[PDB]
Amino acid sequence: IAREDVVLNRILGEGFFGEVYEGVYTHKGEKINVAVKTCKDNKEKFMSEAVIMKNLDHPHIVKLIGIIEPTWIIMELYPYGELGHYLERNKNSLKVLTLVLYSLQICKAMAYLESINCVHRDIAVRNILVASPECVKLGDFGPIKWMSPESINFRRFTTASDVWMFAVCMWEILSFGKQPFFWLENKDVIGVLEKGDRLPKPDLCPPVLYTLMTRCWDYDPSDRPRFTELVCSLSDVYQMEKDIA
């Protein structure tokens, strides 16, 4: 990938390491809309996540097109934008079926990541991209109100703590993008969790799906479902909602 093959058109916004731009990438003459991540120990880490994304090849994880070793990461651009904002715009037209579909698609992403003990740390609707109305994609690697107790208290992140956060993300999806614990300030989140209080069931969320969510919010990380079991469960929730629809 040569920099002459990538034209920058506009700022997309501000990423962890530097600016993100949108532009177009052109070897067969096809014009491809891309997001270009840039970088102002953090350079090497910037590169590490890029190499990881280059090796990931999954339908529900954002696609890396190439890397320009001013180091640019050329990612596929999804113009629909973040899932959170997509949900709030279309909350009156979106059906429960589709919201379970989105959760299942991210869970398939996570299940793949789990199989290589790869902890993601930012499974949140703001970090999920809408590729099409029936396809969401998990964004780049990494939020007190999304984190498990053992991450808030001990800065420990495992696949089990990703499962907790995944259930927080499902809560966000079934809530059409509300922020978890928006009635709480950060300081009293862990206190609330220590007591055994959780997020309440969203109005549109089927009870079977909320039971699954509560299992992911087990204070004990060992008791939480694995992502492989969740995919089967949600596949099961999805087929049922589809039959009702």
Ligand X SMILES: CN(c1ncccc1CNc1nc(Nc2ccc3c(c2)CC(=O)N3)ncc1C(F)(F)F)S(C)(=O)=O
Nearest in space to 118 (alpha carbons), one of 49, 188, 46: 49
Cβ-proximal residue to ligand X, closest one: 13
Q: Which of 50, 77, 94, 209 binds ligand X (CB under 6 A)?
A: 77
For residue 139, state whether it binds ligand X (rule: CB under 6 A): yes
Q: Which of 9, 42, 43, 79 binds ligand X (CB under 6 A)?
A: 79
Q: Which of 4, 14, 30, 41 binds ligand X (CB under 6 A)?
A: 14
| Nearest distance from C-beta of residue 153 to ligand X, angstroms | 27
**Residues 6+ away with beta carbon under 8 Å from 90:** none
| Nearest distance from C-beta of residue 127 to ligand X, angstroms | 5
Report how far residue 5's alpha carbon sits from residue 25's, in angstroms, rounded to the nearest whole number: 6
Report how far residue 178's alpha carbon sits from residue 175's, in angstroms, rounded to the nearest whole number: 6
- The residue among 57 and 223 lying less far from ligand X, judged by its C-beta, is 57
Spacing of C-alpha 245 from chain mean position: 26
Residues marked active site are found at: 122
157 is annotated as contributing to ligand binding: no
- The residue among 32 and 192 lying less far from ligand X, judged by its C-beta, is 32
| Nearest distance from C-beta of residue 151 to ligand X, angstroms | 21
23 is annotated as contributing to ligand binding: no
Report how far residue 205's alpha carbon sits from residue 198's, in angstroms, rounded to the nearest whole number: 15
| Nearest distance from C-beta of residue 144 to ligand X, angstroms | 19
81 is annotated as contributing to ligand binding: yes
For residue 122, state whether it binds ligand X (rule: CB under 6 A): no
Interaction site with ligand X (CB under 6 A): 12-15, 20, 35, 62, 75-79, 81-82, 126-127, 129, 139-140
- Per the annotation, binding residues for ATP are 12-20, 37, 76-82
